[PDB]
Amino acid sequence: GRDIDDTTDAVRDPQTLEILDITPCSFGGVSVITPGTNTSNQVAVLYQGVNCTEVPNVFQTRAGCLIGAEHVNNSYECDIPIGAGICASYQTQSIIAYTMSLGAENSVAYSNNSIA
Amino acid sequence: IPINFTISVTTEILPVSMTKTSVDCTMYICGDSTECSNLLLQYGSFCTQLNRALTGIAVEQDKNTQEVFAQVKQIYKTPPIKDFGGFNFSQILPDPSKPSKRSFIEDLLFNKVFNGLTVLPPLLTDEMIAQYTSALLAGTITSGWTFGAGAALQIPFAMQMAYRFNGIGVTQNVLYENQKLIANQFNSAIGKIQDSLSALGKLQDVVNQNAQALNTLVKQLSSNFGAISSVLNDILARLDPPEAEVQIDRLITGRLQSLQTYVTQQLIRAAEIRASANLAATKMSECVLGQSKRVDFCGKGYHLMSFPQSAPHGVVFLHVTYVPAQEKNFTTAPAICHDGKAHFPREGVFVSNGTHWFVTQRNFYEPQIITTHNTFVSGNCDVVIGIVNNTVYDPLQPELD
Amino acid sequence: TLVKQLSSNFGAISSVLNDILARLDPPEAEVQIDRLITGRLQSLQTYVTQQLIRAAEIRASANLAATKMSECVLGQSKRVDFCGKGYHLMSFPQSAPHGVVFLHVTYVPAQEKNFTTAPAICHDGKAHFPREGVFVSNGTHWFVTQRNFYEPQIITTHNTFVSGNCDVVIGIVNNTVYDPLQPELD
Ligand SMILES: *[C@@H]1O[C@H](CO)[C@@H](O[C@@H]2O[C@H](CO)[C@@H](O)[C@H](O)[C@H]2NC(C)=O)[C@H](O)[C@H]1NC(C)=O
Ligand SMILES: *[C@@H]1O[C@H](CO)[C@@H](O[C@@H]2O[C@H](CO)[C@@H](O)[C@H](O)[C@H]2NC(C)=O)[C@H](O)[C@H]1NC(C)=O
Ligand SMILES: *[C@@H]1O[C@H](CO)[C@@H](O[C@@H]2O[C@H](CO)[C@@H](O)[C@H](O)[C@H]2NC(C)=O)[C@H](O)[C@H]1NC(C)=O
Ligand SMILES: *[C@@H]1O[C@H](CO)[C@@H](O[C@@H]2O[C@H](CO)[C@@H](O)[C@H](O)[C@H]2NC(C)=O)[C@H](O)[C@H]1NC(C)=O
Ligand SMILES: *[C@@H]1O[C@H](CO)[C@@H](O[C@@H]2O[C@H](CO)[C@@H](O)[C@H](O)[C@H]2NC(C)=O)[C@H](O)[C@H]1NC(C)=O
Ligand SMILES: *[C@@H]1O[C@H](CO)[C@@H](O)[C@H](O)[C@H]1NC(C)=O
Ligand SMILES: *[C@@H]1O[C@H](CO)[C@@H](O)[C@H](O)[C@H]1NC(C)=O
Ligand SMILES: *[C@@H]1O[C@H](CO)[C@@H](O)[C@H](O)[C@H]1NC(C)=O
Ligand SMILES: *[C@@H]1O[C@H](CO)[C@@H](O)[C@H](O)[C@H]1NC(C)=O
Ligand SMILES: *[C@@H]1O[C@H](CO)[C@@H](O)[C@H](O)[C@H]1NC(C)=O
Ligand SMILES: *[C@@H]1O[C@H](CO)[C@@H](O)[C@H](O)[C@H]1NC(C)=O
Ligand SMILES: *[C@@H]1O[C@H](CO)[C@@H](O)[C@H](O)[C@H]1NC(C)=O
Ligand SMILES: *[C@@H]1O[C@H](CO)[C@@H](O)[C@H](O)[C@H]1NC(C)=O
Ligand SMILES: *[C@@H]1O[C@H](CO)[C@@H](O)[C@H](O)[C@H]1NC(C)=O
């Protein structure tokens, strides 16, 4: 069995006459998150784009789970980017991973006969 | 001199960013063989150079998106009360019914579009971009252009419309005596926009080009390049290193050439997309956050305002303009001299219907009577090429009694 | 990187031509010299292409800088957010190593005050519109002021122009215009 990529994806067992599907082993990439060697030495490693059952603190993210960092419920300005709307920083000490916040929220006091 | 006017909404499409891809270099070139990696190790830092270029492009894509959309710091929100002097922004404002905070047009837009080859998620999802666009719309509606220079200054929408007409040489009262007409025209135009959209060749061409290039890179893996087979697993077998090395070298050279070609094309395309993103950022900064006076930069006709909407890997502008409709041929005169003193129009143009004389603004027929406050005197009517005889009212002598 | 590409065999027996010219005669040194030549030509072409692309980018940046110098400095600009955030006043150019630096002087309002406004005022059946200002009221009286700096003046016949009657304007209020002519008639 062949695909668009012209590489085999299905094969029939020569003994049991049963067909088998083959898919590649997840490879991804490795990135290191650091706040600078001047401030501290703790680092966090990001295994990109892999369900971390495969890899031998864990926080699952859309870009790949990040280990070595904690997850908080707050949201601050993006210090260094990760992907899919997640940023990490050295605010709290350890490495934290949060969701980036666009900014302060305000509502304009608007009415049909008011000017400033 | 035009007698009537029409409001026309015009759309414009601009690409902003492209898909971020990263190519596993040694996995593409050799796959998983150790001998192939050792044999490739003696060429140099081509692998690292390609990886560095392909990461720089990916960083630049997020820089482009952030520059285009992140132009405001505070996320403004419209009040629940919707009293904009008759205008209806329900089509472009977010609706709570939809799970994502996307407008009726921002969603219609979204419904019209082993080797080592990986993609990367964008830094900003499709929710944060929608939040930015909603904030920009709310700021433009509820504060005019003032939110582009400091804190938001609330102002009634009708008064903002009057001042925006004043900005293009049409006096205020034209709006105030015709508010319902402009409101109905704008509502009909914005309805026709969504009718017509339900078109995006610019946004689709980049996707097609990227897909074609990636597919060609994939398909370049089935060529012999002068070897006996196109798969390294059939070279490692049936042969020992001493004469398999030459064929592996041929494959390595071919695949390196393919990788370099693909990287160069990607770099050129990224530069083009960067230029387009800079243009889109300039349009967003000038047409939206303020009123523009550059001819044919924010739509055809005189510019009033624009509303930004998001799109997959792009941005869409809805320029609201002002176009005169009906004309009337008139007989004009450069100046009028009453008693040997030539009077020139202060800000209007002299027109006549055949028997009398009037002064009117250029962009909308509003005939007034010549007085001493619509004209200023200079010299005598002996050097002006075109001159006529008429009398100025001079509203001072009737009240002297 | 271009410098470091000179220490690669590219499939030869040595990375230095002085060790190929010796220990070998031309007939079989030619193939290895050919391999080295091909590798170094590829490196040179790659470097030249990258330099060309970078030069194009720098040319675009230089054109943008020239436009900024021509418009923000030599004159006053009215393009929003082109010569700094806020209303533009002037700019001063300073040099830098392989670059140029601009110091944009701008104008930003600071303190706000909520006011009650009105589209127009009709005195005796004649609706008066502001000539260049906006109508504001502090609660008991009415004033006309410029938009960008509170400077309350008194409504007269020279700050307003008449048109029609107060029957078609959506928002209208009742007030009187000073009309500074009748007091001096005596
Ligand atoms: C300017 O054009 C508009 C648009 O046609 C005119 O508005 C029309 O007015 C007539 C008469 O009241 C109505 O029957 C139409 O339904 C109106 N059209 C729309 C789209 O509302 C307007 O009358 C024109 N101005 C002048 C001075 O003739
Ligand atoms: C040009 O405009 C003037 C001003 O409207 C017209 O003069 C008026 O004409 C009407 C029509 O008979 C009269 O009822 C008014 O008494 C006239 N007013 C004045 C001040 O004369 C004039 O008729 C117009 N001329 C043409 C050729 O249309
Ligand atoms: C405007 O009026 C003046 C004065 O009434 C005109 O000036 C005279 O025009 C007549 C026309 O033949 C000449 O004979 C006189 O010599 C002119 N000067 C004087 C002092 O009477 C002027 O021509 C008129 N403009 C026109 C008709 O376009
Ligand atoms: C609105 O402004 C007017 C003008 O300044 C105020 O009227 C003055 O108020 C002071 C304070 O008592 C008096 O001394 C003046 O005689 C008033 N002048 C006039 C012309 O009336 C008015 O008080 C202000 N209203 C509010 C609510 O602040
Ligand atoms: C401004 O003043 C005029 C005249 O004093 C008001 O017009 C009258 O308003 C009363 C209010 O009930 C009506 O009963 C009359 O029919 C109106 N016309 C006349 C000729 O008296 C007008 O309402 C005032 N504007 C306001 C209060 O906003
Ligand atoms: C081979 O032998 C096994 C058992 O010895 C049998 O099950 C099978 O059907 C035979 N044929 C093939 C093709 O495996
Ligand atoms: C490192 O951090 C310290 C403390 O924040 C600071 O004083 C210093 O300037 C930083 N850089 C270096 C090179 O020490
Ligand atoms: C990872 O694999 C587990 C296996 O059960 C599955 O439950 C989970 O949803 C997977 N997560 C992702 C992100 O693929
Ligand atoms: C964060 O929120 C989740 C769900 O809302 C909750 O279970 C968790 O305890 C919260 N953690 C903190 C530190 O507030
Ligand atoms: C605005 O347009 C919507 C969509 O047609 C309509 O339902 C609504 O009645 C209009 N007016 C207002 C005030 O929302
Ligand atoms: C005005 O009248 C002239 C005289 O015939 C004619 O040529 C011209 O087309 C007319 N213009 C309009 C707008 O009716
Ligand atoms: C305008 O042109 C006509 C030709 O038809 C000529 O008779 C007249 O003198 C000209 N007037 C001016 C002010 O140019
Ligand atoms: C003006 O008063 C209104 C009424 O409460 C308030 O909502 C608004 O924030 C005030 N604006 C300023 C600038 O004080
Ligand atoms: C302004 O809105 C209020 C609602 O609080 C309404 O009573 C009033 O009639 C409106 N006036 C104008 C001029 O729109």
Author numbering:
A (entry chain A): 566 to 621, 641 to 676, 690 to 713
B (entry chain B): 714 to 826, 855 to 939, 944 to 1146
C (entry chain A): 961 to 1146
Provide the authors' own sentences about this structure as they appear in the paper.
The SARS-CoV-2 spike glycoprotein is the major surface antigen of the virus. Its function is to bind the host receptor ACE2 and mediate the subsequent membrane fusion required for cell entry. Here we have examined the structures and receptor-binding properties of spikes of the B.1.1.7 variant first described in Kent, United Kingdom (now termed Alpha)10,16–19 and the B.1.351 variant first described in South Africa (now termed Beta). Recently emerging variants of SARS-CoV-2 have acquired other substitutions in the spike including a number located at the monomer-monomer interfaces, at the receptor-binding site, and near the furin-cleavage site.
